[PDB]
Each structure stands twice: as structure tokens, then as C-alpha cells.
Swiss-Prot record:
Residues annotated to bind substrate: D181, C215, S216, A217, G218, I219, G220, R221, Q262
Residues of the full protein shown: 1 to 282 of 435
Annotated keywords: Acetylation, Endoplasmic reticulum, Hydrolase, Membrane, Oxidation, Phosphoprotein, Protein phosphatase, S-nitrosylation
Tissue/organ expression: Expressed in keratinocytes (at protein level).
Residue list for modification Phosphoserine: S50, S242, S243
Annotated protein name in UniProt: Tyrosine-protein phosphatase non-receptor type 1
Subcellular location: Endoplasmic reticulum membrane
């Protein structure tokens, strides 16, 4: 079926939970043996969210190459994304090592450091220009260059220096700051505006490594971001845009990381975002 009328049909019939459970039943199951090794317990935020072995990002290190991060490679859309958990106190150096080694231009953050009164990720970037951060375990230096605070999101320019080689690179930090503590946004307008700002920066384009996107676990809000982006790109590429099937795209993405889209409300919000977005593109 088309999307917008499939949407109203699920609303009128109140069957979002059944649609979402079907997706959960059909989703791929691949091994995640490296994630579960005892030496990696303090590298995982949640025991039930792990990268598959076949798609995990490897650190370029011989001691321990493990990070909780997955490469999502969308062949028809010609887009790739790295989805990862919010960094932990003992993985902030690994996080920036990955950014460096994978040649990423942008980092997309969809959570606040504290939500619901608890810490959802480490404070992994510097908040003042004159107070830079040094990651001694991976030999990197990170400096805040500029910060632009808007009503729904903040954009930061950062400099990452590899202290071994003295090479430097400019990284863009796109921080969506207004996702509510509970539920999903009432309108997709600010989330779509944010997606378009990431696109306009070059951070999603083939001349760079894959964008790094995270929330707390790296599957819920993060899944919503890449699902909406890929569906809108396919609608521009194909002769028949109404052939784009959001459930099929989601199942393809779940071949590369488990659990993408965590609730039936997140599924409905993803439909809404693609529907509204497709009208603005034209
Ligand atoms: C339908 C032909 N035009 C476009 O698709 N325009 C755009 C704008 C953005 C953004 O994506 N497509």
C-alpha cells in the first residue's frame, strides 16, 4: 500500500502495536559474540543492546578492537551510517578514535546528557574554547571552535588532532536538544528541519566517511533519524515514489543493527516524518 493512506488505515483501526510486533518477529537475528566477551562488559551500556559481529566497527588496535557501534550500509540509497551508543566514561577515547579512523565529518546526537534525572551519556566534548580535552588512551586532542545555539538544536565546530601525527580535522557536532523525556514529538517539523541542516553540511555525503549517530542506546531515536533520511532519498531516486515501503526499509536496516525503532510510537512518528517531508521536498 501507499504510505499516507496505510497510515490513516492504521490510525483508524488502532493497530500500531500489532504492526510493530510483526516487525519484531520478522527481524534478523545474527550473532554478537565479541560484544558478550567478559573483557568487554564495561564497554556496553545496556546488556540487551549489542552490535552484530558481521557489521560491527573495529577499532584499529591490537589489544582490544571492540566498540558498541554498527555500520548500516544502504545499497540502493547509496548512504551509510554508523549507529552507536552514547559514550561511557571508559569509552570516550574509543569514540573519538572511531571518528578519526572512519574519516567521519559529522556526529549526530539525539539525546541530552541528563534525561529523567539520570545520566544518558558522558560529557564527551568540551564546553569552553579555552578548556580542551585530551584522551590519553587513544592519543587525541579535541577543541571547541564555535557553538551556535538555536531553539531546537545546537551546532558545534570541533577540531580533532591526532597527537601521534599532528594531523588535524574539522568535525561538525549536530545536537538535537528538544526530544521529550517521554514519548515522541507532537509534530515532525523540527526533527525534519534538523535532518535538512545535517544534510546541508556535507556530513551525509559520499566524499566523507559515514556520519556517526547516537542517542543513549543507539537504536531508537537513532533508528528514526536514518530511517527517515533513507526513505526520503529513495522517494527522490525512484520513478514511482509511492513504491517506497517504510516497513521493508526498516527490516533491511535491522540486518545491520538490532532493535532499530524501540516502540510503536516511534514507528508512527517515522511514518509521519516521511509523509510530511515528502511534501516539502517538492
Ligand atoms: C522532486 C524534485 N525535487 C526535489 O526532490 N527536491 C529536494 C529537496 C530536498 C531536500 O530533497 N529533494
Amino acid at each position: 500500500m501507499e504510505m499516507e493512506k496505510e497510515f490513516e488505515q492504521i490510525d483508524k483501526s488502532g493497530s500500531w502495536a500489532a504492526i510493530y510486533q510483526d516487525i519484531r518477529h520478522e527481524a534478523s537475528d545474527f550473532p554478537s559474540r565479541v560484544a558478550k566477551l567478559p573483557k568487554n562488559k564495561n564497554r556496553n551500556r545496556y546488556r540487551d543492546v549489542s552490535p552484530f559481529d558481521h557489521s560491527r566497527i573495529k577499532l584499529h588496535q591490537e589489544d582490544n578492537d571492540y566498540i558498541n557501534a554498527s555500520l548500516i550500509k544502504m545499497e540502493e540509497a547509496q548512504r551509510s551510517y554508523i549507529l552507536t551508543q552514547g559514550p561511557l566514561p571508559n569509552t570516550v577515547g574509543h569514540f573519538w578514535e572511531m571518528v578519526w579512523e572512519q574519516k567521519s565529518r559529522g556526529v549526530v546526537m539525539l539525546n541530552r546528557v541528563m534525561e529523567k534525572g539520570s545520566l544518558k551519556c558522558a560529557q564527551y566534548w568540551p564546553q569552553k574554547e579555552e578548556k580542551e580535552m585530551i584522551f590519553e588512551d587513544t592519543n587525541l586532542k579535541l577543541t571547541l571552535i564555535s557553538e551556535d545555539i538555536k531553539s531546537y538544536y545546537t551546532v558545534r565546530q570541533l577540531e580533532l588532532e591526532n597527537l601521534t601525527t599532528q594531523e588535524t580535522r574539522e568535525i561538525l557536532h549536530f545536537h538535537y536538544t528538544t526530544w521529550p523525556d517521554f514519548g515522541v514529538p507532537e509534530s515532525p517539523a523540527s526533527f525534519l528541519n534538523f535532518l535538512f541542516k545535517v544534510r546541508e553540511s556535507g556530513s551525509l555525503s559520499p566524499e566523507h566517511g559515514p556520519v556517526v549517530v547516537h542517542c543513549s542506546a543507539g537504536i531508537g531515536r537513532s533508528g528514526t533519524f536514518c530511517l527517515a533520511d533513507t526513505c526520503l532519498l529513495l522517494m527522490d531516486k525512484r520513478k514511482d515514489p509511492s513504491s517506497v515501503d517504510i516497513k521493508k526499509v526498516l527490516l533491511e536496516m535491522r540486518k545491520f543493527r538490532m532493535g532499530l525503532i524501540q516502540t510503536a510510537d516511534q514507528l508512527r512518528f517515522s511514518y509521519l516524518a516521511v509523509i510530511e517531508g515528502a511534501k516539502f521536498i517538492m
